[PDB]
Coordinates of C-alpha atoms and ligand atoms in Angstrom, one line a residue:
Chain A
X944 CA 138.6 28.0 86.7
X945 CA 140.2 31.0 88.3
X946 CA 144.0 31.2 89.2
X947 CA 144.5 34.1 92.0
X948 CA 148.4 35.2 93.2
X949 CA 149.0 38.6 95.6
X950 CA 152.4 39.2 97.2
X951 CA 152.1 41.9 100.3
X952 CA 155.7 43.0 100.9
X953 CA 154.4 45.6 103.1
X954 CA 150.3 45.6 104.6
X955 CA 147.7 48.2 103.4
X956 CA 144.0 47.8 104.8
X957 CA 142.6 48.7 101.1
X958 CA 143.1 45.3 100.1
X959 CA 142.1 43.3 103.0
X960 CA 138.8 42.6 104.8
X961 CA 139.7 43.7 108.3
X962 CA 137.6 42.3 111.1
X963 CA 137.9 43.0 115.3
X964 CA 140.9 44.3 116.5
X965 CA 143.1 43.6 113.4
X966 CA 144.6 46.8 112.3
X967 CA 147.3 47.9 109.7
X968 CA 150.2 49.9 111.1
X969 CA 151.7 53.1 109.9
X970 CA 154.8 50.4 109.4
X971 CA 152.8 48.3 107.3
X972 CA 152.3 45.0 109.3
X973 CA 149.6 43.8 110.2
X974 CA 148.4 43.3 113.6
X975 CA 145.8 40.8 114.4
X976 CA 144.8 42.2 118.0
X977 CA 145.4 44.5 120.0
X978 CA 149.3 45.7 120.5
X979 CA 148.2 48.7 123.3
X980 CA 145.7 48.8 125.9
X981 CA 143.1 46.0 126.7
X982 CA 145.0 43.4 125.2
X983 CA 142.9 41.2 127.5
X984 CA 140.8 38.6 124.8
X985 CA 141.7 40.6 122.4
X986 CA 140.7 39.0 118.9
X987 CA 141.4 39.8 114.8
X988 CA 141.6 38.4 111.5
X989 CA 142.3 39.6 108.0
X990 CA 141.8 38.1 105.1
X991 CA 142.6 39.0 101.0
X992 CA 139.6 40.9 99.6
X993 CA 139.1 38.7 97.1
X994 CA 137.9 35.0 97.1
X995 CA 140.4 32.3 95.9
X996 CA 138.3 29.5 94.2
X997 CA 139.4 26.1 95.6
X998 CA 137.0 23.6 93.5
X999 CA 135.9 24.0 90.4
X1000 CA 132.8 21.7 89.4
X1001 CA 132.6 22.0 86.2
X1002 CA 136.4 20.0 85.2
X1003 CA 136.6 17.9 88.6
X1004 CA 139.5 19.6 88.7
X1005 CA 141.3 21.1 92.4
X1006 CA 143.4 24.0 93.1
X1007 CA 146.9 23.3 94.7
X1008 CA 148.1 26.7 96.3
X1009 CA 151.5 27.6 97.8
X1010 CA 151.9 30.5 100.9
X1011 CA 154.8 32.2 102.3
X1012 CA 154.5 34.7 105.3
X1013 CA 156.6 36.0 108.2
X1014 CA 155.4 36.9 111.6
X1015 CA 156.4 37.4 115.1
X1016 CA 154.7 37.0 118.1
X1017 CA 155.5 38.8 121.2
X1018 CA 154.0 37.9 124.7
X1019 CA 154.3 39.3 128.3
X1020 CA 155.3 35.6 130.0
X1021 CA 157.2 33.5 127.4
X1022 CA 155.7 30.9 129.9
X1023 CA 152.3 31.3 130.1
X1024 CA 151.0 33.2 126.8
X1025 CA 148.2 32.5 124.4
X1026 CA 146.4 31.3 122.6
X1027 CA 148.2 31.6 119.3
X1028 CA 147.9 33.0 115.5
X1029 CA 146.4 31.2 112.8
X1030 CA 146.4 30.8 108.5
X1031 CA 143.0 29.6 107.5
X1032 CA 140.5 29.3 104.7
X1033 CA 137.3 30.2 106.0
X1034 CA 133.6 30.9 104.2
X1035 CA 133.5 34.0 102.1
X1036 CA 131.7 36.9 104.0
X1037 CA 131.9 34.8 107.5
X1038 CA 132.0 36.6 110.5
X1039 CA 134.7 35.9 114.1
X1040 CA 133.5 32.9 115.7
X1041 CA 134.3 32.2 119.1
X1042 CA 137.3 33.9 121.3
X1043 CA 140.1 31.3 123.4
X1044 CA 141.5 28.6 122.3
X1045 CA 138.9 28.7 119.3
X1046 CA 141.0 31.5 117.6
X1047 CA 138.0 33.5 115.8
X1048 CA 137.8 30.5 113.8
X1049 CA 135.7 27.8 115.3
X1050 CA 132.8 27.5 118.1
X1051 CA 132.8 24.0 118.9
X1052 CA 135.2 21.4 120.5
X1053 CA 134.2 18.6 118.1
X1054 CA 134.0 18.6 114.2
X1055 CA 131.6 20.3 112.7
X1056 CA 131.3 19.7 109.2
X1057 CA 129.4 23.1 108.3
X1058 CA 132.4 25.1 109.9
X1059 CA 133.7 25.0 106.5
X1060 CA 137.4 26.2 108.0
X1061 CA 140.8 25.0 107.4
X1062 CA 143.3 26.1 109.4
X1063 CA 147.4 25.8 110.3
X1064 CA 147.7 27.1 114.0
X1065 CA 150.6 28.1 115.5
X1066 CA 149.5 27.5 119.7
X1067 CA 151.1 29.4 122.1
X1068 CA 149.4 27.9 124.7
X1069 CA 150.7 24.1 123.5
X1070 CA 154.2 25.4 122.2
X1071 CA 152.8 23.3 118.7
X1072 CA 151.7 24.0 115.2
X1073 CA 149.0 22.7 114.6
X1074 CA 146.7 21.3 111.8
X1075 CA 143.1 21.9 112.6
X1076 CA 140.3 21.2 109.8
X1077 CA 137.0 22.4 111.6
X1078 CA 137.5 21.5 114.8
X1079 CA 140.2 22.5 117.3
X1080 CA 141.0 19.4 118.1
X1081 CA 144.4 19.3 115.5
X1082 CA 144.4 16.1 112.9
X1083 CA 148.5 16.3 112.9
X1084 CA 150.8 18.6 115.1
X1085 CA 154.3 18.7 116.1
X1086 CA 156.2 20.4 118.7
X1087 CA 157.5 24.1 117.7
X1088 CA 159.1 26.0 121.0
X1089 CA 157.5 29.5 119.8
X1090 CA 158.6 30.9 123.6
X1091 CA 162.2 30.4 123.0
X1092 CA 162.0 32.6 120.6
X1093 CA 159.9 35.1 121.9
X1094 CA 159.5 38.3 119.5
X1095 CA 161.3 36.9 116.7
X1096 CA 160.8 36.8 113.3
X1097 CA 159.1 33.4 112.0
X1098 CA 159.1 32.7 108.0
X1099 CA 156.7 30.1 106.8
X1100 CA 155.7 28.1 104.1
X1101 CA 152.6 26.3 103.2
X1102 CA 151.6 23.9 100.4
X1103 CA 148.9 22.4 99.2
X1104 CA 149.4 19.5 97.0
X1105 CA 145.4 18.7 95.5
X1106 CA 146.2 15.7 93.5
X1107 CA 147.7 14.4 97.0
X1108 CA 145.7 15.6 99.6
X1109 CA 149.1 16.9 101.3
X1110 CA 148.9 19.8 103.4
X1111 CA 152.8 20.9 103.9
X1112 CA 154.0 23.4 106.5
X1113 CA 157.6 24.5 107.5
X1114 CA 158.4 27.1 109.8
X1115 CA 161.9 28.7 110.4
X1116 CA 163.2 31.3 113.1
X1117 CA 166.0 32.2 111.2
X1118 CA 167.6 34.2 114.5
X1119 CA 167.6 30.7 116.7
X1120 CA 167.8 28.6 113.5
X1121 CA 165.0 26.7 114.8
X1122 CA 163.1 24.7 112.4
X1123 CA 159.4 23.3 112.8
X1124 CA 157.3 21.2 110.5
X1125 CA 154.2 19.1 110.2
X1126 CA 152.1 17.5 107.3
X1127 CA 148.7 16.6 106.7
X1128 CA 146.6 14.6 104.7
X1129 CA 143.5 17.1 103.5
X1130 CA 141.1 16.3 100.9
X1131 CA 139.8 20.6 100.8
X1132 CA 137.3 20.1 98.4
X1133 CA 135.4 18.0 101.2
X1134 CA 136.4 20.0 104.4
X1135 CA 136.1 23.7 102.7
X1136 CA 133.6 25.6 100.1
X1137 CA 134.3 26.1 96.6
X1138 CA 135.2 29.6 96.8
X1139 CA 137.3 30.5 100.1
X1140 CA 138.9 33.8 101.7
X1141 CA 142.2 33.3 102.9
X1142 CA 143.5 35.0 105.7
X1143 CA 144.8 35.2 109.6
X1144 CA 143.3 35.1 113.2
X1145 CA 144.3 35.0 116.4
X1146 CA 143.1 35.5 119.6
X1147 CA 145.4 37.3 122.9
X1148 CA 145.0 35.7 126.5
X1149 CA 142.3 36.4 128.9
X1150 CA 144.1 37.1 131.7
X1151 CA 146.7 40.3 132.5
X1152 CA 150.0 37.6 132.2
X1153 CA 148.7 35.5 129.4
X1154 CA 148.6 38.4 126.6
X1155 CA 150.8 38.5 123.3
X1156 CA 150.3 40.2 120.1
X1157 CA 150.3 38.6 116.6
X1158 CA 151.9 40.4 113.7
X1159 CA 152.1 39.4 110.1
X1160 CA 155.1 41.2 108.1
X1161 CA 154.9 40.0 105.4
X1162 CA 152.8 37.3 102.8
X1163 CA 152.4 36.0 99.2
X1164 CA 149.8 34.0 98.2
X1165 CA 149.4 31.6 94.8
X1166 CA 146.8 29.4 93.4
X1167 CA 146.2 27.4 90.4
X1168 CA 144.1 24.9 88.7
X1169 CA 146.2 21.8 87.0
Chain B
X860 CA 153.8 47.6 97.7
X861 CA 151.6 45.0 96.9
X862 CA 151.6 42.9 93.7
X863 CA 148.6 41.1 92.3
X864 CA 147.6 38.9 89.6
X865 CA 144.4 36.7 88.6
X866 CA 143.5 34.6 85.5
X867 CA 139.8 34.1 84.9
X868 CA 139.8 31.1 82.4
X869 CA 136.0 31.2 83.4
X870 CA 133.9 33.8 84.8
X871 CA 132.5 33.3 87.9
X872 CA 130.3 36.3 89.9
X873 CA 131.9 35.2 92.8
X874 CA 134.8 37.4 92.6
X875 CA 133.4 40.1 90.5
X876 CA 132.0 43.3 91.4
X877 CA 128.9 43.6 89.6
X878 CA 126.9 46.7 88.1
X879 CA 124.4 47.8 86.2
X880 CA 123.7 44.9 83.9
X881 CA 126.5 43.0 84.0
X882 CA 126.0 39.1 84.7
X883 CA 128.1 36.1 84.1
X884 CA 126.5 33.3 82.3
X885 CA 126.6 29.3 82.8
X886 CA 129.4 29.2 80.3
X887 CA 130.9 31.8 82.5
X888 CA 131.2 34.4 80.1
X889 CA 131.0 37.8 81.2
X890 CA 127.9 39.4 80.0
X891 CA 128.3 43.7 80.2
X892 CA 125.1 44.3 78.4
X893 CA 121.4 42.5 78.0
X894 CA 121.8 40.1 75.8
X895 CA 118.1 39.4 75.8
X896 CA 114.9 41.8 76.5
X897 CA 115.4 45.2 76.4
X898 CA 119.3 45.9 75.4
X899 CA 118.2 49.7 74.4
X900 CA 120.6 51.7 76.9
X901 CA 121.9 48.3 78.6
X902 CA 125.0 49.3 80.7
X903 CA 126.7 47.2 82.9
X904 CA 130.3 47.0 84.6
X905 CA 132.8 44.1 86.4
X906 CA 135.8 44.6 88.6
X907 CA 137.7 42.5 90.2
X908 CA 136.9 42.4 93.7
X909 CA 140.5 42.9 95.0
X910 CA 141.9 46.9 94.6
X911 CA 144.9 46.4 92.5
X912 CA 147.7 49.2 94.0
X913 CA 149.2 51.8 91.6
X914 CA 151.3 54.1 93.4
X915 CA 153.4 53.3 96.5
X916 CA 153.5 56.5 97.6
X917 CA 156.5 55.1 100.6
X918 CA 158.5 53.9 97.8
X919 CA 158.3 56.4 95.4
X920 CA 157.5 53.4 92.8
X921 CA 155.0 53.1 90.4
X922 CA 154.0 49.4 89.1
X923 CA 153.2 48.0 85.9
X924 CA 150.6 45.5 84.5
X925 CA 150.0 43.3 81.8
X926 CA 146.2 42.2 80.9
X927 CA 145.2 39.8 78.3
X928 CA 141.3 39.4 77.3
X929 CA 139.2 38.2 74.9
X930 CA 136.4 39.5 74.1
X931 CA 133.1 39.7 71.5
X932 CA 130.5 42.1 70.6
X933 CA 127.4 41.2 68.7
X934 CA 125.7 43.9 66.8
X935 CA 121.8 43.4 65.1
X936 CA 123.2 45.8 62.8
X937 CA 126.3 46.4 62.4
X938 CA 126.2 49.9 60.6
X939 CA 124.4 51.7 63.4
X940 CA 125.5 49.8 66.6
X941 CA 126.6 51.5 69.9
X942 CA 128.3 52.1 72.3
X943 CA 130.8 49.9 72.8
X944 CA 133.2 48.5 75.8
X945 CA 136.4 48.9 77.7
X946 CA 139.0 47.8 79.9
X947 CA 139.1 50.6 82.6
X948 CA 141.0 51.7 85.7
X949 CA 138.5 53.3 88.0
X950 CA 138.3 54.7 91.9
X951 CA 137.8 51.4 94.5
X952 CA 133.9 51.6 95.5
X953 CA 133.0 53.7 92.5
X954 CA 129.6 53.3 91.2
X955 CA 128.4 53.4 87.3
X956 CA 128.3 57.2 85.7
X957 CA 126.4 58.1 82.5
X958 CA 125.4 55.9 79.7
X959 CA 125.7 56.0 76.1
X960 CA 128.8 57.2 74.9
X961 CA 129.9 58.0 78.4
X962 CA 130.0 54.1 78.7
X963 CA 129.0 54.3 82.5
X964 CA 132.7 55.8 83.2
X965 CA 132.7 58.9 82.6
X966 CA 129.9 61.6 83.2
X967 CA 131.2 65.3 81.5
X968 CA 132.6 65.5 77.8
X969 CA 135.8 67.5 78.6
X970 CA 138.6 66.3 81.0
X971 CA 137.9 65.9 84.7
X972 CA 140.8 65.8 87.0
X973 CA 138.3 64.0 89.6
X974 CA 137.3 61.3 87.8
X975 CA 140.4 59.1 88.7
X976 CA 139.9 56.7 85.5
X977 CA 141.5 55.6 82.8
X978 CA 139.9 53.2 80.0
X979 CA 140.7 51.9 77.0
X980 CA 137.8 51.5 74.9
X981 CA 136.6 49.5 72.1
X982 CA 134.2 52.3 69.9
X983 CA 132.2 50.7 67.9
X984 CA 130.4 54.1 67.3
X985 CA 133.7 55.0 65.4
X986 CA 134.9 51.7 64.8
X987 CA 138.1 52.8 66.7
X988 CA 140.4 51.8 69.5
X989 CA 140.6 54.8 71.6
X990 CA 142.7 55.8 74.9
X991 CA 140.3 57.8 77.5
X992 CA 142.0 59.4 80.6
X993 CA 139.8 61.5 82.4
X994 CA 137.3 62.3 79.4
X995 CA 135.6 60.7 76.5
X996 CA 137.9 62.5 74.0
X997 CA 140.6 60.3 73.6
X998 CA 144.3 61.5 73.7
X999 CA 144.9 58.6 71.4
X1000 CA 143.3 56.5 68.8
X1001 CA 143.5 54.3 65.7
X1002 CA 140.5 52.7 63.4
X1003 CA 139.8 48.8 63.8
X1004 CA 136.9 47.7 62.1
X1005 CA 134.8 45.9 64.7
X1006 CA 131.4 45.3 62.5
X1007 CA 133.8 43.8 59.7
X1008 CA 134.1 41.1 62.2
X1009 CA 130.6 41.3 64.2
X1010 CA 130.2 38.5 66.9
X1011 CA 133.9 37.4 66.3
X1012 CA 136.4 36.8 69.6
X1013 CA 139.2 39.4 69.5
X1014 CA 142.1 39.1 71.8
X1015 CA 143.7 42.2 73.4
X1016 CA 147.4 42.6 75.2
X1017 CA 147.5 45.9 77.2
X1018 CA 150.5 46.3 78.9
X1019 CA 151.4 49.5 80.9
X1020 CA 155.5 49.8 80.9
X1021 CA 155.5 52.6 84.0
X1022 CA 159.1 53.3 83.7
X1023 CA 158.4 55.2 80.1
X1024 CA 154.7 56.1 81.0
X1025 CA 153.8 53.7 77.9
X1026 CA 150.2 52.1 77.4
X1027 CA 150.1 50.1 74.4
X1028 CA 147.2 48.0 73.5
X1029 CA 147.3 45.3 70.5
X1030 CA 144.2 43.3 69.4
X1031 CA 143.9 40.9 67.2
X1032 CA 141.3 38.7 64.9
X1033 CA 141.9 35.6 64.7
X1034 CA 139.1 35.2 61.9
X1035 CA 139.9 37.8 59.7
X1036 CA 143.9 38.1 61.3
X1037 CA 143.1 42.0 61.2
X1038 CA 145.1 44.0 63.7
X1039 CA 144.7 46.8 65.6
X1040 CA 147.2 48.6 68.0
X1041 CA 147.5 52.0 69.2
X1042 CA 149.5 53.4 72.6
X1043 CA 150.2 56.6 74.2
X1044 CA 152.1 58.4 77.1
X1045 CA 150.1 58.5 80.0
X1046 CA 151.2 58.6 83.3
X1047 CA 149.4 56.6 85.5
X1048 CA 150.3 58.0 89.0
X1049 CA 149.0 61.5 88.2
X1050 CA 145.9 60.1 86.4
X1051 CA 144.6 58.0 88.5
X1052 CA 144.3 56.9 92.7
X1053 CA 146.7 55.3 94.0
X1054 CA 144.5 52.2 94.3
X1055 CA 142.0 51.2 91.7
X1056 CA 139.6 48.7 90.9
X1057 CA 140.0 46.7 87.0
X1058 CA 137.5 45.3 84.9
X1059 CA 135.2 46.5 82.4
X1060 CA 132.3 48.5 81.3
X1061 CA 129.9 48.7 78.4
X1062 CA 126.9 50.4 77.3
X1063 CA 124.5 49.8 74.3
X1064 CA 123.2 51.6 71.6
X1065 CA 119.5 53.7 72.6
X1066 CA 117.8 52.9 69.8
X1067 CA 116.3 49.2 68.4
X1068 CA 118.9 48.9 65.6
X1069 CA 121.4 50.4 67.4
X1070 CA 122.3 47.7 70.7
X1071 CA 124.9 45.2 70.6
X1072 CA 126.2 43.1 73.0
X1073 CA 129.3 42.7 75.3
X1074 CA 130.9 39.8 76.1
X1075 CA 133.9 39.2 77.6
X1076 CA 135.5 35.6 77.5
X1077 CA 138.5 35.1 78.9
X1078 CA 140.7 37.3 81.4
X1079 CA 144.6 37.9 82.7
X1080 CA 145.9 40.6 84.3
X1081 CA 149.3 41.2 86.7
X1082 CA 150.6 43.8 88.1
X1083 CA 154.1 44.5 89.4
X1084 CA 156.4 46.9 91.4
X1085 CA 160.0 47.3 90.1
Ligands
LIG1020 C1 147.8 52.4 102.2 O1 147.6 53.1 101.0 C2 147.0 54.4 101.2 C3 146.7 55.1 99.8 O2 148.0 55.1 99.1 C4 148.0 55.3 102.0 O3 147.3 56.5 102.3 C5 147.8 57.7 101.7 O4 149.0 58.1 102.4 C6 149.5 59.4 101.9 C7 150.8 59.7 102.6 O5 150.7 59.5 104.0 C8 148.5 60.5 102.1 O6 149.0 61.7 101.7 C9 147.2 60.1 101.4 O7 146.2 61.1 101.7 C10 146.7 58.8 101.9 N1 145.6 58.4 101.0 C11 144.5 57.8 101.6 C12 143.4 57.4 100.6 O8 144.4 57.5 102.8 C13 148.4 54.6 103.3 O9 149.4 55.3 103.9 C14 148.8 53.2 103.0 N2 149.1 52.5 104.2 C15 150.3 52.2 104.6 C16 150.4 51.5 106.0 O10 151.3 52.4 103.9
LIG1021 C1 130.6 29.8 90.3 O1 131.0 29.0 91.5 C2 129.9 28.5 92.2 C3 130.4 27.7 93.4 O2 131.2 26.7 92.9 C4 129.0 27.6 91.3 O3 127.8 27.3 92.0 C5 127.7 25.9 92.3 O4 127.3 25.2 91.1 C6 127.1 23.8 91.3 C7 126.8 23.1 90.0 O5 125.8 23.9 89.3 C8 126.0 23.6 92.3 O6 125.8 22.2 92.6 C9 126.2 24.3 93.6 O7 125.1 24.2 94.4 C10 126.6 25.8 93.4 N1 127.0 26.4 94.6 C11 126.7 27.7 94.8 C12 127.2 28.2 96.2 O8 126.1 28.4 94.1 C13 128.6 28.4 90.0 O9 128.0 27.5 89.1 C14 129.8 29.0 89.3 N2 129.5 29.8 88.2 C15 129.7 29.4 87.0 C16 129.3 30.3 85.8 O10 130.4 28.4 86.7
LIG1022 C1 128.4 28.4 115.1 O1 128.4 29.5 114.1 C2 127.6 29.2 113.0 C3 127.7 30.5 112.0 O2 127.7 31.7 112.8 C4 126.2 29.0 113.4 O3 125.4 28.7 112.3 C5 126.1 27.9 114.4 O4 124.7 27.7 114.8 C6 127.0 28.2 115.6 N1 126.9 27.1 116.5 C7 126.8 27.3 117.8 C8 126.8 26.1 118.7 O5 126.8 28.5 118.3
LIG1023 C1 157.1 30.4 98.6 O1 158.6 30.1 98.6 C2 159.0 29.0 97.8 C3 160.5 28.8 98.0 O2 161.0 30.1 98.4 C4 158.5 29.2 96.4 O3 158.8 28.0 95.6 C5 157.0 29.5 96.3 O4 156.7 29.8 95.0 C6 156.7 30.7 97.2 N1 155.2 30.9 97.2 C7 154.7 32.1 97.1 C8 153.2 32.2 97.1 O5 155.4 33.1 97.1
LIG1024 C1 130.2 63.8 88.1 O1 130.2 63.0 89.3 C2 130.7 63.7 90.4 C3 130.5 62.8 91.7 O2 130.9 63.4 92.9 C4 130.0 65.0 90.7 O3 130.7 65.8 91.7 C5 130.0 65.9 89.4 O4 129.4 67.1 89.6 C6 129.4 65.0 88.3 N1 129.4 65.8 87.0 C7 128.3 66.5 86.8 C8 128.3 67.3 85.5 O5 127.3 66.6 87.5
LIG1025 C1 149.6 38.3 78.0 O1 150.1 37.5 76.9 C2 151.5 37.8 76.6 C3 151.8 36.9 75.4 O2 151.0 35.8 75.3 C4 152.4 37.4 77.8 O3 153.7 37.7 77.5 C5 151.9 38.2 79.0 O4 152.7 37.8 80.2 C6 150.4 37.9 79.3 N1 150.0 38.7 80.4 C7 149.0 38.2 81.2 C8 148.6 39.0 82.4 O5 148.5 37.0 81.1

């Protein structure tokens, strides 16, 4: 097996695979679509240059992983923005998928089993967080008022628990001292391949009032085989 | 800064950069060299496929690492094998150099301000443990009989200590419990880019009873800003 941590107190575009509008700033964030100009279906995702192993074969053995990042979203109309910033686990070397509501993740409605994609969304459009394993149609969300706290600061944490199948997520906007959380029971080792990169999407409104940018600050990353 | 640590119980090619000759077996050992066919002037080299960050220039902070490996080499003969293999520090997208006793790193004799790498290397030309920054003649060694101990696992500890510019490297033989160690003052930042790819590179012997092979078995390495 391979065990895989990373801990990006400030972005740098050497160590990431940068695709679409995602770009590092001079500030070192990272920003998934476009923060000037057409911001109109604007779409990026990053991910860690180096795949994280998530089954191993050989000892029927599964990685649990743990990751902690900050962001901030900032839209135009607190009221009508989308479509939201994602975490996901996605096929090595796969390209954006579909725009919208499918986040550069997904291009179907339905499950599709050879999507291979995991992913924790955080919907602008829906005000949730959501839990979608390939297919945007979420297996677990709960409520998260992301508008209220338009422009802030959002720290996360996710855990994956292998021997459990449990898919953890807590979210805190430590300015309103709002809290958000949902769970999610996730057998990976059926719903993703064995080798995954991990990284962020998200996908800007298509219309002039409906545009937002996505921003990562901040993010650590640890996996292991137990 | 970034921080970044790995540990390969098994190889897999999957994150690996691959060159030359360099495979990974279904044990998933990592195999620098042939090991069958033609092994006269095999050369092969492995990085991990993530850049591992060195300097942060903004912080005026250099990081530290700590990388534990095992390894074994195999001579036919072990009076008159070559060349041998190392642990090196090279540019990110850098492609194999010269062979032989150049061990696919390095590609004039004398030092070379441009060549951005940093190896420690295994000589089994010289049966010695030598320190190359930036040319083939090391600014440090110390003997260590490797055909005393011909295809036997050693296990190395490098750790770079940035604060004090100290590289130490320890190996041991479990087998024979011989120990070799040597270290030096070599500052990193001024050596090397501020982002560099780790791994490995070996070359063998150009002659029948002169090639060896190149295995490593096992690998750790973390890096750390403070
Ligand atoms: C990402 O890392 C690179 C390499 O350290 C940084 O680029 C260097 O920046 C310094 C100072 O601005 C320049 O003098 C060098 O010429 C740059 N080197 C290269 C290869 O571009 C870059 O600034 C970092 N990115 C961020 C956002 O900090
Ligand atoms: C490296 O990882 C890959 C992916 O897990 C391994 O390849 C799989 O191996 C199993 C068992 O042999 C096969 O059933 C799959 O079809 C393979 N998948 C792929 C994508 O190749 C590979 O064996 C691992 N390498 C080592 C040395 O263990
Ligand atoms: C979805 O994308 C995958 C990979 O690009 C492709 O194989 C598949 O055919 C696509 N499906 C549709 C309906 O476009
Ligand atoms: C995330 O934070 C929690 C608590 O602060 C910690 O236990 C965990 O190890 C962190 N994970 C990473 C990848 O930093
Ligand atoms: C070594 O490689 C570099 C690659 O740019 C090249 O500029 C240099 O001339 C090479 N050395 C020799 C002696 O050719
Ligand atoms: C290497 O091994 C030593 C002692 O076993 C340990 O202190 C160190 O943290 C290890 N480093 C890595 C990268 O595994």
């Amino acid at each position: 097996s391979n065990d895989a941590s990373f801990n990006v107190e400030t972005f740098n575009k050497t160590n990431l695979i940068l695709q679409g509008d995602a770009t590092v700033s001079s500030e070192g964030h990272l920003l998934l679509t476009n923060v000037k100009g057409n911001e109109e279906d604007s779409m990026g995702r990053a991910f860690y240059s180096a795949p994280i192993q998530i089954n191993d074969r050989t000892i029927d053995n599964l990685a649990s992983f743990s990751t902690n990042f900050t962001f901030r979203i900032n839209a135009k109309n607190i009221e009508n923005s989308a479509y939201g910033l994602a975490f996901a686990l996605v096929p090595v070397g796969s390209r954006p998928k579909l725009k919208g509501r499918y986040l550069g993740l997904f291009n179907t409605t339905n499950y599709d089993r050879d999507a291979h994609t995991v992913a924790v969304v955080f919907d602008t459009v829906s005000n949730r967080i959501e839990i979608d394993v390939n297919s945007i149609r979420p297996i677990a969300t709960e409520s998260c008022n992301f508008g209220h706290n338009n422009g802030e600061k959002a720290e996360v944490r996710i855990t994956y628990d292998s021997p459990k199948n449990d898919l953890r997520v807590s979210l805190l906007y430590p300015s309103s001292e709002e809290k958000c959380h949902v769970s999610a029971t996730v057998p990976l080792e059926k719903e993703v391949e064995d080798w995954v990169s991990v990284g962020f999407s998200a996908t800007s409104g298509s219309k002039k009032e409906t545009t937002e940018t996505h921003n990562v600050l901040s993010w650590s990353f640890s996996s292991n085989f137990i």
